[PDB]
């Protein structure tokens, strides 16, 4: 039972990423980083990336997390905002605290790869 299956699988991931961007694009800490971003593209890459990371099918063909955030010099408060918004998204979707924590603990290992790049 992967975290991906525990979340609800493909249909849950497809609903979670656009809901998570609705919250991120309203969050003053981070919304502006996406000002010039093609959000259809980003939603597709990030859905593939989180599906792969959480134990679903691995079809992620994009950049690693250092290259993806290169030149942004991202700060700790920006990564905390992303995790808070992903957690709030999964809660709103009906995922249990225990599963949200499993998912955040996997994604948290990427923090050192993207901060300050
Ligand atoms: C730390 C706060 C973060 C901010 C502000 C942020 C912002 C961004 C931006 C602005 C881009 C795209 C540059 C462009 O193509 O338009 C991007 C790419 C990406 N980010 Fe983040 N990101 C953050 C954290 C994360 C996290 C935690 C993950 C996943 C766990 C993630 C996964 C990705 C992926 C998969 C891409 C696309 C790479 C590709 O297109 O090859 N990001 N991010």
Curated annotation (Swiss-Prot):
Give the top-rank taxon of the lineage listed in the UniProt record for this protein: Eukaryota
Residues given in the record as heme binding sites: 69
Q: Does the keyword Acetylation apply?
A: yes
Give me the comment on cofactor binding: Binds 1 heme group per subunit.
Cofactor requirements of the protein:
heme
Q: Pfam families under this entry?
A: Bac_globin (PF01152)
List UniProt keywords, sorted A-Z. Answer: Acetylation, Heme, Iron, Metal-binding, Oxygen transport, Transport
* Cited InterPro entries: Globin-like_sf, Globin/Proto, Globin_bac-like_CS, Hemoglobin_trunc, Hemoglobin_trunc_I
Q: Subunit comment for this entry?
A: Monomer.
Q: State what protein this is by name.
A: Group 1 truncated hemoglobin
**Species this chain originates from:** Tetrahymena pyriformis
Q: What is the lineage of its organism?
A: Eukaryota, Sar, Alveolata, Ciliophora, Intramacronucleata
